[PDB]
Amino acid sequence: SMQDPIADMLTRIRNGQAANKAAVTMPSSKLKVAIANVLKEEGFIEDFKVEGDTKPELELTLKYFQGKAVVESIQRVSRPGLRIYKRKDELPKVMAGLGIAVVSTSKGVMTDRAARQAGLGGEIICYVA
Amino acid sequence: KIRTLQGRVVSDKMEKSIVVAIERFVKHPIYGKFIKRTTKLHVHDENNECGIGDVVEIRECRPLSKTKSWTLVRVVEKA
Amino acid sequence: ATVNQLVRKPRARKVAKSNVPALEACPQKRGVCTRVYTTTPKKPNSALRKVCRVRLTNGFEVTSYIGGEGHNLQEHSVILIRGGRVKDLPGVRYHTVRGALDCSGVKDRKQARSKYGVKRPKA
RNA sequence: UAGCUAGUAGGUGGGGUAACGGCUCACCUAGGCGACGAUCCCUAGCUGGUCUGAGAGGAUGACCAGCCACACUGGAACUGAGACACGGUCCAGACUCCUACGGGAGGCAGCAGUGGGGAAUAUUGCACAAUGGGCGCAAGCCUGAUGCAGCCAUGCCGCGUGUAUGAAGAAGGCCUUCGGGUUGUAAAGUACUUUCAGCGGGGAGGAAGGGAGUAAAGUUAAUACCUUUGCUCAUUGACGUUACCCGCAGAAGAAGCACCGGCUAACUCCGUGCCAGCAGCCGCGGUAAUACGGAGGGUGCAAGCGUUAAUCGGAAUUACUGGGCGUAAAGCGCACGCAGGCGGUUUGUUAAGUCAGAUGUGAAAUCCCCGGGCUCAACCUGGGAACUGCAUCUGAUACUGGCAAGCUUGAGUCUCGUAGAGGGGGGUAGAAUUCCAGGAAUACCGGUGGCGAAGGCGGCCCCCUGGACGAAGACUGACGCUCAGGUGCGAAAGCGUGGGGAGCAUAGUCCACGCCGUAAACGAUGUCGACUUGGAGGUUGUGCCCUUGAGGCGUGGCUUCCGGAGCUAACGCGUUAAGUCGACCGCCUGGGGAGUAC
Ligand SMILES: [Mg+2]
């Protein structure tokens, strides 16, 4: 990317959700390992392998259950220059809470249940559905 | 001790008196954007011990002159 | 638009103006009867209508339609205006209070009385 | 409206106020504020909240409550704890008033009233009985603040104007195809009850204090006096011939108003015939008007109903949650860029951004939820929640941000070649072409080529210069992308000054020095970056491969031509986007008047 590494990643993934390729790959900062170690665990994709040490870079495995593809409607919201630092008792539940809401907390990125369990919100990263 | 408001020096063409701007973020009240806004307030100091371009710690004081109600405490930056 | 195009200048309005300029924030103004004119409407209509130009009290002079079923106007006395423009005649953007100071009612309507100077007939 | 400002901006000093002070007077210093909108002209009192909106947001500031400003119009002060002083003084005037002409009085932006301008907004009311105020040792005085009463459907929430039964489906009205139908169980007539108003009689609480007596452990002469506590009588309301309860008549006093073509709930007939007329838009009327006028019947609402005026809503129709620009209004003709906005990649670190935790604080009253009181409801009300806020301590380090340290892909310099109407100057000169000499500029290549940021630029060779490209290496370590103003380059003509005159429009066209910035200056498609089915041709390279070749597989770059998904109102775009996005800039919000008035 030039001027957001995480926004321009989220174009790269769901273009794989429009031709149903197997593996996708983007140049991977240490933040970017902490991105898809949430999407795997909540079940939206399957497996990933970092590789490279002068170009640290990922091998994400997609997940399309049918002709239907699992990662339906992912959206970045906090785009740079429009930071929305949510207080935690405003929190965006995604699609009546049926999805997950990736929030950049202190204690990590892994965020469904920061509403009650962790107990501190922050900058939204992206809605996920 | 109030907050020890950090600021800069903009100009010194005055007799024992300086001009301080202060960096300051804010939510823009209707759009939700962060505009870096700065103010401009005259500050009393005697020794001319800070130069044009430093970084200054400031508390309030008695209103000495017109247009100037802040004394220097100390300086944390050379020119 | 971009956020930093709405910042340095706000969203300006879409300004709305008044089309009853005999307000002065009022609903009814008094008038002293310049003439009675009998001009004609446009192409889809016929049958020339009854209008009067009116000398107001704010300082203006403007025209007004004298509807009903026949009128009673010697032309050096008082009327009262209502607004609510006629579509037909070019320039008449008013009405008259049918039954007011010096401009009495119409000769015996019996449906929709109150919008003209017709009161309860006999009972 | 882009410049403003000298007591202006600052410092020693005196002087000055209750207080810091340029608050003033001499002196020195030469500043101060400003695109994060100063001076300027126009307009306006500000908030808690009211209205509307699901929300954000939008117009509002009347009432009750907070805070300033002003007392006929300009001034200055005196007293005072407090004023630059509404029912005080002085200086003027101005109106206004009065005068023996010499002079004196005047101020409803107090309540109640007149004139008047007005669409229109009320009584020359009663009481100190309440709660507050002032003065007091209280008594009490005083209070056009408050407590009340008249005025007016201006608004809100009740409430009645009767309920049963009843057809022969009555006379009656209009419709009628003359079979009838409908009004209509409607009425009549039998049953039945009097709310409220009429009228009659008793009849809560808003009243505690105060004053009088009489008791107490009071402190002092131990019982004088007084202060406090408890007891006893008399008491004390404007409203108010009160609220409410009770008594008797007799269906008895009590129903309008708009619409009826479409949106929009309700229809048929007479009269009129593009005349009279309706109307919010669509529109109706020129012999059969479900729209005009009238009559029956219907609809909706109701003691009001319509009309007009006024704000939001529908309006995603100024869009932050919630828009758009290839043709529907809309991408500056094009370039670098200043202040602005925005970060590759790793570690350290700080804790401002933000999250968390409390502690302050957000006046009470409205809004909101459980709960009380008026016979219910409006309304009055107890407690909560909420007031989305700002300031402080403690905590958190993932993102972001300043400081410190790095690494190679963004970018950038070098080497090295390659292709080319990129220009500037200098002269050159014909495949061609009028006059008696020379003005012009390409025939060919010439094209879907090719250059450049665009307008653009084509003879030939050299000269100074401009950009891109490829093959490798090398090192710089974020050094970048974008742009309001800003400054350049700017098709024709026109014009200026200095000449010419053929091809041929009589200057001008042509060179040149200066203005002029204009246009289909129309990819009618800002810019950079990364991603996604493609297929055939263009042209520039250059790696591998018997190069064994004109040639294959790659692999660079830009430009064509048709087309998937996706998208678009279509038409269509479609790896050079308009498709999925991110950062930033320009611009539009119905047509005419108008690229015009000043
Ligand atoms: Mg009583």
For residue A48, the domain's CATH number is: 3.30.1370.30
**Token digits for B25?**
């973020």
Name the structure determination technique: cryo-EM
Instruction: List the CATH number of the domain containing C82.
Output: 2.40.50.140
SS3 C6: helix
SS3 per residue for chain B = CCCCEEEECCCCCECCEEEEEEEECCECCCCCCECCEEEEEEEECCCCCCCCCCEEEEEECCCCCCCEEEEEEEECCCC
Nearest alpha-carbon partner for C70 in C25, C106, C33, C24: C106
Please check whether residues A64 and A79 belong to one and the same domain.
no
Q: CA-to-CA distance for C3 and B46, rounded, in angstroms? A: 45
- Domain extent, residue B47, equals 1-79
Q: Is A98 on the interface with B (CB under 8 A)?
A: no
**Token digits for B72?**
């220097």
Burial class (CB in 10 A: 0-12, 13-18, 19+), C28: exposed
In sequence order, the β-bridge partners of residue C6 are none
User: Which nucleotide shows the minimum CA-to-C1' distance to residue C24?
Assistant: D309
Domains in chain A, number:
2
Domains in chain C, number:
1
Are C51 and C85 in contact by the 8 Å Cβ rule? The answer is no
Nearest alpha-carbon partner for A91 in A111, A121, A48, A125: A121
Please identify, among A22, A48, A71, the residue that sits at the C-terminal boundary of a domain.
A71
- Domain extent, residue C67, equals 1-123
Burial class (CB in 10 A: 0-12, 13-18, 19+), B16: exposed
Please check whether residues A65 and A119 belong to one and the same domain.
no
Nearest alpha-carbon partner for C71 in C121, C105, C28: C105
Domains in chain B, number:
1
**Residue listed under structure tokens 């195009």:** C5
Instruction: List the CATH number of the domain containing A109.
Output: 3.30.1490.10
For chains B and C, CB pairs below 8 A equal 8
Q: Is A82 on the interface with B (CB under 8 A)?
A: yes
SS3 C4: helix
Nearest alpha-carbon partner for A31 in A12, A50, A14: A50
The one-letter amino acid at A68: K
- Domain extent, residue A32, equals 1-71
Q: CA-to-CA distance for A7 and A4, rounded, in angstroms? A: 6
Please check whether residues A96 and A51 belong to one and the same domain.
no
Q: CA-to-CA distance for B10 and B12, rounded, in angstroms? A: 7
Are A39 and A62 in contact by the 8 Å Cβ rule? The answer is no
Please check whether residues A2 and A59 belong to one and the same domain.
yes
> How far C17 CA lies from chain B's nearest CA (Å)?
27
Q: Which residue of B has its CA nearest to C5?
A: B31
Please identify, among A40, A56, A71, the residue that sits at the C-terminal boundary of a domain.
A71
User: DSSP secondary structure string, chain A?
Assistant: --S-TTHHHHHHHHTTTTTT-SEE--B--HHHHHHHHHHTTTTSS-EEEEE-SSS-EEEEE---SSSS-S----B----TT---B--GGG---STTTTSEEEEE-SS-S--SGGGTTT----EEEEEE-
Instruction: List the CATH number of the domain containing B24.
Output: 2.40.50.140
Nearest alpha-carbon partner for C58 in C85, C31, C78, C34: C31
Are A74 and A13 in contact by the 8 Å Cβ rule? The answer is yes
Q: Which residues contact A30 (CB under 8 A, 6 or more apart)?
A: A56
> How far B26 CA lies from chain A's nearest CA (Å)?
12
Nucleotides of D under 7 A from a protein CB: 9-12, 20-23, 29-34, 36, 56-57, 59, 117-120, 256-260, 274-285, 293-295, 304-312, 317-320, 323-325, 340-347, 352-356, 391-393, 395-399, 407-410, 480, 528-533, 564-566, 580-590
